Amino acid sequence: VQLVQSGAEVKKAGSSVKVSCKASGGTFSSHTITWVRQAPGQGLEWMGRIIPILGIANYAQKFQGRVTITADKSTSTAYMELSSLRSEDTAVYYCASLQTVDTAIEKYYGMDVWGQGTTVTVSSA
Amino acid sequence: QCVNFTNRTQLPSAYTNSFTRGVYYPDKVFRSSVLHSTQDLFLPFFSNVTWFHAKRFDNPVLPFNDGVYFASTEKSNIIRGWIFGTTLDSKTQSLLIVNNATNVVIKVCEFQFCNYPFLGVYYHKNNKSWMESEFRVYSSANNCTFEYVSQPFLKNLSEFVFKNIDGYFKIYSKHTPINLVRDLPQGFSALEPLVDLPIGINITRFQTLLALHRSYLTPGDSSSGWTAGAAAYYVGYLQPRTFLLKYNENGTITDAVDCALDPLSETKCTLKSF
Amino acid sequence: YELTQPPSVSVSPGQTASITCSGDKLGDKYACWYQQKPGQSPVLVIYQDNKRPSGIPERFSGSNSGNTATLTISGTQAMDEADYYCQAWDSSTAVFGGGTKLTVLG
Ligand SMILES: *[C@@H]1O[C@H](CO)[C@@H](O)[C@H](O)[C@H]1NC(C)=O
Ligand SMILES: *[C@@H]1O[C@H](CO)[C@@H](O)[C@H](O)[C@H]1NC(C)=O
Ligand SMILES: *[C@@H]1O[C@H](CO)[C@@H](O)[C@H](O)[C@H]1NC(C)=O
Ligand SMILES: *[C@@H]1O[C@H](CO)[C@@H](O)[C@H](O)[C@H]1NC(C)=O
Ligand SMILES: *[C@@H]1O[C@H](CO)[C@@H](O)[C@H](O)[C@H]1NC(C)=O
Ligand SMILES: *[C@@H]1O[C@H](CO)[C@@H](O)[C@H](O)[C@H]1NC(C)=O
Q1: Rg (CA), chain A
Q2: What superfamily does domain A4-122 belong to in CATH?
Q3: B202 lines ligand 5 (CB under 6 A)
Q4: Which residues, 6 or more positions from B164, have their beta carbon under 8 angstroms from its beta carbon?
Q5: Residue B233 domain-assigned?
Q6: N or C: which end of chain C has fewer CB within 10 A?
Q7: Mind telling me how many Å the CA of A34 is from chain B's nearest CA?
Q8: Hey, which residues does B36 pair with through a beta bridge?
């Protein structure tokens, strides 16, 4: 299992950012794709998760109503959409994967595979 | 979901003697102190029952034929259930029996079954009563037509008889204390009727559901760190036989005669005596 | 739910390093430990409070008792200078600690 993300990039403030994470071929059959962001100067922060093989997306309470985590089985790509970007959203966005699809089993595992991280920064001009 | 295991060792299988195991109650009629002759799908007396005993061991799909006698003498509770069907994929109906500590779940759905179906078993903070199960049995389950939840039926020998007749899947079971490790015990123990399921499906193949523990983890590889699946069980096949069953005073089948075993049993079934 | 973690722990090379993680009844919960080098992805070094993933060296060890989860490194060598994140699972949501910057003296 290898997770490959999109490129580091800059977006307008209040724009829509669409961060991809391309997994391996057989990854989405039995994995949970979590999205975890890391602001520069602060620690890790869980944003959400998606189970694509049974198609649910759970979100953190801080990011609820703002982010939407989707998946595409045909391209094997887990997408994370974050709208209404402010200046506090400049972060490295990692996709991680767990070797489980039942969310109660997720405590018995860790995020063993991680993406390289997408550096998303914002700018008015 | 599906974990693809590679380089699977075939399960070693010996041939044990059946003795007089696998007799069940053929109906739900109380009979007291009689000899009842019945013609049904019975495991024949002293038949070759195949014993699967035990890296990575293969979990074989076995034929169903006319019904399966399934025995197990286990203490680790590695056997969790069985799947039944013909193609064992989404093109046909399939039957799934899964036990846990509190319930048994019986589902006839369209399962796209995994090639190595199992349950990941996890103990929360090494608490033996806090056991959680992860279903690694099927990748999808669509157009599901039957579901049934009841009490679980899984030193102690556990015997089951599975029949699929007249649109009904019939399960009979018995749990008895034994003091043998090698082969099946002698003596007699009739299997009481456990459940009749109106499911009306075609069953030609079946497979045992195993319970595996994730022992260690390798990042990126989901097929690593599970236990070997070393399970031992006895499989025999039912044949249409006539049996002379002895019902005692309290209505319990205590002894039986397989009428086609030898000329003495033929004489016993002709005379209706033992 | 919040997890508290010391901001920095400094050790000599070859000595035992201890990194704590406090939380409200964390001993009843599973805590993972992640290692992140500067400019790299996080690496899972401890899961289920004491179990190592394969490929992690055997000097990493973990414990979780009462309100504290401890990551211990026996014989700290030059490649352990990183950030260490304590992570727990609360109400089927991952929660991360503040992260301890473990540095190696020179
Ligand atoms: C069936 O049992 C006999 C002994 O009764 C044995 O010789 C034979 O090998 C068994 N059949 C198979 C296929 O092993
Ligand atoms: C039952 O399944 C077998 C194996 O797939 C098949 O050959 C047979 O036609 C089926 N019978 C019915 C009545 O569908
Ligand atoms: C056993 O399975 C049933 C499914 O009907 C479920 O309700 C129950 O919580 C399960 N028990 C355990 C201990 O997982
Ligand atoms: C094990 O789990 C049960 C709940 O299923 C709980 O009541 C019991 O206290 C636990 N045992 C220990 C030693 O914590
Ligand atoms: C079975 O399920 C599939 C998808 O779930 C559907 O396309 C198909 O129509 C279903 N068939 C029946 C007979 O319900
Ligand atoms: C039948 O029941 C009676 C009274 O409950 C008991 O004394 C007897 O041992 C039982 N068994 C047989 C084989 O008679």
Answers
A1: 14
A2: Immunoglobulins (2.60.40.10)
A3: no
A4: B64, B67, B84, B170, B201, B203
A5: yes
A6: C
A7: 15
A8: B245
